[PDB]
Symmetry: none
Subunit: 37 residues, 3 copies
């Protein structure tokens, strides 16, 4: 009579961390310039 099945294998390694996200949105237009001379 055949022997019992063998034990289950080990878990695979965790998947690697993902890529970084896209860079941010460009910022707001700057302040208004000072009045002229």
């Amino acid at each position: 009579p055949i022997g019992p099945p063998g034990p289950r294998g080990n878990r695979g390694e965790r998947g690697s961390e993902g890529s970084p996200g896209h860079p941010g949105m460009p910022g707001p237009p700057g302040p208004p310039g000072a009045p002229g001379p």
Copy 2:
């Protein structure tokens, strides 16, 4: 005797990876409107 039993089951696959780090900040916005007279 008894032949050896069956090969065990395939281990469960590892857990899926983490979401990536956030991306870098976006560039500074453009210059402001030219000032008045």
Copy 3:
């Protein structure tokens, strides 16, 4: 009946998803001084 062999190690988990975009960029430089009317 002897136990069977250990199953193979499970597969590697898949690569995690990309992260969030970066934060919006800083404001720009003040605008140029006004012209000399």
